């Protein structure tokens, strides 16, 4: 029983985040526990304050017509508890629910350690007969409770795109809104826990540029190659595999390259030396002592600028 | 209270995908959040437009008789919220629900990295007394919302097989439909993340074809064999094990072969050399430098053509 | 309000498997989505065909008395949707629900790679006052939908034990039925993925029977021992650990024995050689070249016959 | 509407285990599917046998007052289906439900492989006005269905402590009962799968007491140290980590000790030999050949007696 | 129908923890099963003791107005069962439910092995018209059942902050309470299971300060580096990765430092020795024998004081 009106019915929305949590880097989802405030004029149940009742009259969701506000990018239904309903004498209804849902918003790990994400919460309403348009009341949208957090992240801003996107879906318009939670990853431990140890093992590997014994250098390079893979297993992360090409996966691919040419060099040095030609061997090794750290530094500056400064 | 008719009742179907997600390569399932549009003529509740009411009359699922549409290949029930019911003056009902279910469709990984899948959604309806036959309305079947995604995949087409499969199950005919979601894996990272590093370690392994020391070559081949397994553990995937013989599992089996015959070669070279016969040893090793990369390239071309070009 | 009869009430059962899935080798459970058809004579609601109504009359589960059919070996309750209820003029009721439950049936992995399982579905009914006995209608029991599958398995037969087991539980008899889903594992990949590579590494291990250097043989045997464990980690399976002694675990234990006696041999060969006695050393090594593959083949034939041929 | 009596109301209890499963060694929980039988005299609904009705009268839980029996150590609520209610002519009620719950009972792994556990199920009842005291009827408590199992365990006895513990909680007495499920771990595979292979690798480790090359012994002891950790990773168990000190963790700590002093010895032997003192070196090594197996056997007998024989 | 009063309505709260469990170090959540006692004066249903009824009158939550008490930091809703409602002759209501919820409270692992946590449970109540303020009754807050436990922890004190935080949220005040569960980790096994073996491998690593062979020292240091990583994988913990810098992660980073400079030393020792300069080589090695354990002990004392004694 919708409210008969003279023109499109505006339903004012608003989300107050109480809790944010369970940011799943794998499934690109996150869980939210928030408020949902809705308001619309339904003069059909406007009441007399002086004639009877009081300043404001409260109803049960059974009694009144409520706009069906579904979320778009939610896995299941939006687990909801109705907190309050308050009708104004002119017919202005004030709806407030406390919901919890896991939202499905895509994540872009192309800069994995130093990346920022913008989660989405989408609200729509299908139009039964009178056309329905959702808009946002800023005062009810101040969604961030101060003590709301994602442990690995910093929370920038929870805001909303005021302009709705009025679709046309199966011979009926729909009004879509766009709530946006802006986060940015906080990455202290990655320098001590991930990168620096992975560079320690790699340096150890090309300590064989000051050595001559093929046996020691293979027990050097190859044994450290196992340590690299073993350490990668130790620091295996939920998004270590990604369909697109990440940044962290480029330098991690380059690390796998610098073990190959390290094996290539000690093999070349060994062949040159064993083929009565040590002048060339101990010259390639001398060069490697500088060539490897520079080509590394270079290609990492090339790679850093490739993803970040571009 | 079914609709008494003169002949079989057609129920027009249609599914509008709102969300696709959680494609489980292990359990061969995937989650879907979509619309379900149904329409059928029930002149038993045809209404008078002019005499009373308006253009269209809305009912509650309790009031009217609704056709029971079950999904076949769904794990549990199909979590549904009824969005709208709209009866037409002639008695044409317009049903619309928004459901979410995890569907069970078999996946064929015989070409794992470069594979295409056709997910299925099966609709059936049992016949209470009047025979029931489902068919599809293309206009309500345009299932793909533009911003729907599976992160590892590209989405080709959401279509439906217009011809139903009319069964006979326990003295009652049933009508089954076939909705098809066609996907194809997107595999950028696999060359840098999986294949190339796994080929690097194998090349390192047969660097012992330019070496003579049995100690170094066993510390060579065998140490890299550990690196192969360790890297396979690092890049362990949900479907690495499969009951049938995959492609990726064939070349991965061949990799395990080329470590054996590499150990076979360095062992033969060592025996020939130690049995006062170095002419033959350093001749088999000379051959290995070419024999191994070619038989590999060949058998991989043989293997690629075996699965793909056939 | 149960049906007053003259003697025990028979309730005819039947299960039509629509889906089988999620065979959990660990928890010895599996998920099923099937039909459940029940029928009993309740002349208390026999109706007059000509005098009124039609051929068959439909009721709501509220209206009628329904026998409480519980499952025995189900984790929780049996998620049920009532599909149809159809009473016959003589009072014969036709109940049909579509349920989904995860069943708990023990699994016997004593032949793990090549094993067959018989899953159970147990139905019981307690007797309120009139004694209740369940039996099976074969026509409603044809449970296998043709396109039902467990990916790792072949599905032999879904049948039912016609004879019920009538218990006596807390001063009231109960009638138990036994539905049996017979499966047998399909094991293509195990030869290429599990057994053959695990035999490759073991062959590599005792290549030290054609070598003399203790350093190479320890970097041989011991380095390959790590590869065995690492590969076992790579191919770790849900049921690798079991309280009873499996088959695959016997040969996997034997593999661990042949590394010990391999270390024993190379240590003994080294001691004999270093104690100015090379005649005996290079004689024990000569023998090992034949003793190890034969005792293996033998003890594996002994092991195969022990589990399978007995 | 509680039953007015003359003195405290006794409620007779009883639990019939139908299924036991999902014994979670980590979370110290386990799942149970059982019967719950309750009986109490409520002469307020004693009925006339001859004047009307029959031998026994059945009610709906709505109609009658039922004692609220909660479980203490259950995670959530206790998923219940009401099977039967049977009132006796004198007013004796016979309640029977079939519940399923996961119970929370602490586990003591101080003897992990060879340990016995006593799981608990706690029943309490708060007193509304008349004081309530629960006790057990032995005939309805025979909880073990014969074919009930925990795969890794043997089930000794399901019994109950007849004496309740009558508390006083928030100005109201409560009556607590103690049901006890006694299990003892069945540990066949642990000798072949865990201990024996872990002892093999340790034996291999101190095969370096019959060797002189420091290179072979470091490629011996240290390479086997990796194998120990890798095998521990292969046989990683749910309760491998525990806050208290387990038995299995003591001998596993001692294994880590015997690798250190093995490295200690070969280093000392190498130093003594290289410091022109081979008489002392080859004398410490001679001693190690006996000292290590004896101190091991000893300290394990010391450790076995410390946990078990004490 | 709220209770009309003369001034703000006080609602007295109280939580009796029955069970604590599932402390999730990863998601910083924990599960609780407790009582919730509420009391407020609603003279609107004050009753006449002598005129009718008895001492206390029981209602159904339907009949009475109950304050909506929500939890703030809970994932979903708070699974609740109403145990008792008791109205006093003056109009004082006694509400009592038994709930179970998983709470979301941040955890600080900056002292991981030796850390104490203070979990929070937050109660609020929105004000319908009359202002609502919650406060705590100490007698009903005695939350700790004696036999309540977290296996890895000791439970210090369950108390509550008597002063509420009265907010102003969307043009309506709310009253927030703060319940505090104080725990402290109990860390016996960490010395035998985590630290001591990880120090054993590190000691083994720098046993190469009493050796001269570059081959043995690289098969020494590097082989133990794999063992360090492998052992870290064996002892992988839920919170091993954290966005902030933990204590345990600092000393674990230092361990990674002492493997690098250990390789640096043996490489420098080898270069000095091979560059006809053994006086300097065997002098740097002599110094390392003391410098490494002291700088370790030092930097660990510096590190311990840095986190704990500051």
Numbering used by the authors:
A (entry chain D), B (entry chain C), C (entry chain B), E (entry chain E): 7 to 312, 317 to 320
D (entry chain A): 7 to 316
Kindly provide excerpts from the paper associated with this entry.
During activation of a pentameric ligand-gated ion channel (pLGIC), the binding of agonists promotes the opening of a selective ion conduction pore at a distance of more than 50 Å away from the binding sites. Each subunit consists of a predominantly β-stranded extracellular domain and an α-helical transmembrane pore, which interact via an extended interface.
The equivalent mutation P246G in GLIC results in large rearrangements when compared to WT. The structure determined at 3.2 Å shows a molecule with small differences throughout most of the protein except for the M2-M3 loop and the pore-lining helix M2, which both have undergone major conformational changes. The remainder of the helix has collapsed towards the pore axis as to maximize the hydrophobic interactions of residues at the extracellular part leading to a structure, which, most probably, prevents the permeation of ions. In contrast to the large conformational change in the extracellular part of the helix, its conformation at the intracellular half remained unchanged. When studied by two-electrode voltage clamp electrophysiology, the GLIC mutant P246G shows dose-dependent channel activation with an EC50 that is shifted by 0.5 pH units towards higher proton concentrations. Another distinct nonconducting conformation of the pore region was observed in a high pH crystal form of GLIC and in several mutants of the same channel, including the structure of the mutant P246G determined in this study. Thus, to our surprise, the mutation of a conserved proline in the M2-M3 loop to glycine still promotes activation in both channels, ELIC and GLIC.
